[PDB]
Amino acid sequence: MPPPADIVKVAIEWPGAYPKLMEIDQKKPLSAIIKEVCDGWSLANHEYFALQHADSSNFYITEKNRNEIKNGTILRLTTSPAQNAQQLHERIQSSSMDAKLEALKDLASLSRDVTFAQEFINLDGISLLTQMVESGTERYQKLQKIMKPCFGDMLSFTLTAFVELMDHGIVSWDTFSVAFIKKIASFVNKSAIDISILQRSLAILESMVLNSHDLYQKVAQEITIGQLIPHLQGSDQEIQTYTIAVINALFLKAPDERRQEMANILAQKQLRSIILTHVIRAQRAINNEMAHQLYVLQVLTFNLLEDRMMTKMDPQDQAQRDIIFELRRIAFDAESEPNNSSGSMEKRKSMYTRDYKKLGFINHVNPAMDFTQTPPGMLALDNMLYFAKHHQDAYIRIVLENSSREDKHECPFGRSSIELTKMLCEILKVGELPSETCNDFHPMFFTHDRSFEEFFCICIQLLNKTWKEMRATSEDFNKVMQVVKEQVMRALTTKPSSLDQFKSKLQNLSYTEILKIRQSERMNQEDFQSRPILELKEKIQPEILELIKQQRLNRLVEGTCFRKLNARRRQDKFWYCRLSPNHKVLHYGDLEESPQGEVPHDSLQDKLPVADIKAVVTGKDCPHMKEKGALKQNKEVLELAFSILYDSNCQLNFIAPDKHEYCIWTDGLNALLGKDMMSDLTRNDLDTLLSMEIKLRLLDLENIQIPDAPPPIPKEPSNYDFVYDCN
Amino acid sequence: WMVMNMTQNRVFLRAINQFAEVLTRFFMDQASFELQLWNNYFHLAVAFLTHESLQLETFSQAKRNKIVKKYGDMRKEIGFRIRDMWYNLGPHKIKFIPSMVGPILEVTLTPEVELRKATIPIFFDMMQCEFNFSGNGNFHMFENELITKLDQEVEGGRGDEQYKVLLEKLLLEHCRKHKYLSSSGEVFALLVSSLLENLLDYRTIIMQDESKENRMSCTVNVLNFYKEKKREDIYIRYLYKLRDLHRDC
Amino acid sequence: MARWIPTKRQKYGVAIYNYNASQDVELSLQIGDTVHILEMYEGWYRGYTLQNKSKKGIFPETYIHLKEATVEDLGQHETVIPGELPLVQELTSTLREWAVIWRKLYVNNKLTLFRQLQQMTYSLIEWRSQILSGTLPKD
């Protein structure tokens, strides 16, 4: 039984005054809330107060978004919005400029409501604004040179209000007049405007283009390519994004012929070169808006290719026949005599059949039957023309290559090109509306104005190289498709900058080494620290430490040669300390010079009670190092001190050759004590053994990502009924 | 080339099987003659049976899994063929004894159980046949060297305790399957099991730290066994070992 | 734990991480704990773990990665390229033997042999991760 929620606590503040509390129920109409507030506070004129939120939103209470009301929030009272509108209207034509400034600032800041905007517009606000703007054309000129900054800021606030009103669409479409466009044009034409004013003007222009088409023609009549290029000189990324967005708006609702015209103008101005030298070479904070700009410019280039490739090339065109004749002349000047250029059509058909029976074409009477399907259609003709123009050496090599293919696996150029074009259109999502959240950008599209063609040429050349290396067959079409898709995606993820460097790095890349090194780094970091991975190794540590201790004890059983104390007067310094094969007793004592090692027998001190050993002091606490008489040891053996203390009066002080053997011995002694190890070698061994074990165990999860959150526990039947018998 | 070895052992099994089938074809009850070659025949059969076994492959379970997946254990069918041949063999088992005693020991002490379960009744059959032969007297003549060879096998390191227990269960069943001589056989088997666990203790302590008293008690137990069973050879050799240990202590 | 159906398309039961101790039969399962499941349920799987083939353990479907592939990787066409996944599974068996190898490698100090074995097995796992996906020419 949840407690009733009809009672809540809310304090309604005042500006400069201390709070008073009341219980407010939002289910009842706002009229009841106002009546109860006035009754509690004994305030008359209930229609002259309202409710607004004093949080970061600074909005009033609405029937749609009153759910943000939560217990314990700052809420200060304001006057009713009707009174606010009335005082703003009174102060619009007041005698104080500071009052006008603050009133317009508040009006612009609190211009984020729709219904209150409806109420204010019901007071002929839009008409009054239009009248004061039209009559204010010559009014502000006298004081323009005096208060340009404040006037410009007020204009920016009013333009922001205009933009948000248009976004809500409260103002009618036909209410737009030429005065607004003329004023914006006058603002643009001024050569002493700040960067912000230019950005706002271009935003207004792109909004105008998005609205209709004839106004786009009007603004384009006053748009020159020579004025938007200086905007690129600015190092600010925001202005670059705005200019690119306006450029895209120029390509939105225009005829395709004018699209081609302005594309040719851009090419003759070489816009992509200055773009690459300006925005590509910048190493500042790239905005996702610029990524959207790159994506939409890529879409524009794709549409500029489609509107000329969407049509079907008629096989009956004599001009098409002449074009393909010239193309095959400049391509196949190895098997075809030059005399056929001015010859008859019989030799033309003979060359057609003899050169297309080697290129996977079935029909020999109508060779242009394959040119009626798009994409790409005539794009392949442009690509082969470009090959003949620039890659004539490679073109001739390819011409002499496919016709000489004696492996019975000749690749149909047309079919392969069509398949690759289809795959590229599918991966690049050709024909879909721009995304509102995705911000993928390819900086390599700005290297050339014909960048997509260069990309396709590099792709097909790489495919030809890989296929020549592999000598593929007709049974691995799916393999070819998947490998080319994977390599294209991997190339796109690398974010190249230049075409030649991109193509070189295509060959420079290893066989998915990035994934392996990333997996190794992630595993190492998880070993250092992770929630769902690190606990796995530390969860299971029963065998590693136990077998490490067993190894240390086996090292103790075999033993070695030890050293004695103050062995300078006919005292041998070679002796042995062997652990029992039952691992309970120690055999040690005075022995002789033994280079061989330990001699199996009973020593002088053949007994050592391991249950009576308290601990093993390591370091300067060894009693034998504290002699002040004549048997002082060297400071060099400060790293070689360890004593087996027992009886509180007898000490078993031993001498080690170097560091690692002493570490082994102290690890063995603690293992006898059943404690943690104190050897860097053990830590050296501890990491790898766990690393080796988990490296062994991770193969089950290879090719499968491991979720971080704990998987849920799905329901199970309560009964243990076995449909299939166990065992 | 373990694969070469296992293939060779498979074809060895095939050769032994065809030997058995041709022997059944033309060495029946009419051919009571020339049966001395069966001695060396089964001698070689066991000599082949005594390699490539569970403890040989015990190093890693993967070897056992792969061999049971490809071939399965062959020593099992070696024992099965031996036991069915002995079932079909005939009443001339008396001459087998001084020869057959040695070979059957290793299959007696197999690491496995199930084939040993199926094979144990051969001891019941040979004991009743020993009574058939030795009704004109006693029949120590198998059990003596049986104990001796058991003695030798455990000294080689193949003794077990729960195997005894299963032995005792089986021989209790056999005594229930038999008549008044069952008491004789069962007390003999009591001696057998007690001495076998005696030597099991000996082997499990001869690897541990020397204690020198449980081993000596076990040795005097084996001395009681030998003096009661009218045998002296291993008795004198083990008292020699006792004298050696005394000298050492 | 009812409604269990025989199935042969789940022999490769891939875990996620150390499973909770909610079930007594279930433990902190290791990464390479492939469960050879012989029973099929909508949201759970009980089968034989690799470490203990004689003990069953009921595992959630959300904890089980769907692997229809069997040891025979051509009957279900799981192979990225034919004649390669048998190599990967025999390599898995090889490394499961490497387990007992390094287990027995520490009984005796084989420092030179141990270090060269470390290098060789390092290259081995490197090449296995490299060829986890087959997309190279046959040579």
Author numbering:
A (entry chain A): 1 to 727
B (entry chain B): 1006 to 1254
C (entry chain B): 1 to 139
What does the paper say about this structure?
The human DOCK5 and ELMO1 complex, along with an upstream signalling factor, a constitutively active mutant of RhoGQ61L tagged with polyhistidine at the C-terminus, and a substrate, nucleotide-free mutant Rac1G15A also tagged with a poly His-tag at its C-terminus, were reacted on a grid coated with a lipid membrane [67PC/21PA/6PIP3/6DOGS-NTA Ni (mol%)], followed by cryo-EM data collection. Other poorly mapped sites, notably the N-terminal domains (NTD) of ELMO1 and RhoG, were visualized relatively clearly through local refinement. ELMO1NTD, which interacted with DHR-2 via the Ras-binding domain (RBD) in its auto-inhibited closed form (right), diverged from DHR-2 and expanded along the lipid membrane surface due to the binding of RhoG to the RBD (left). The lipid-modified active form of RhoG should be located on the plasma membrane to activate the DOCK5•ELMO1 complex. Therefore, as observed in the present study, RhoG may stabilize the extended-open form by promoting a series of conformational changes in the positive direction by holding the dissociated NTD from DHR-2 close to the membrane through interaction with the RBD. Furthermore, the upstream factor RhoG on the plasma membrane plays a role in promoting and maintaining the conformational change to the extended-open form by binding to the NTD of ELMO1.
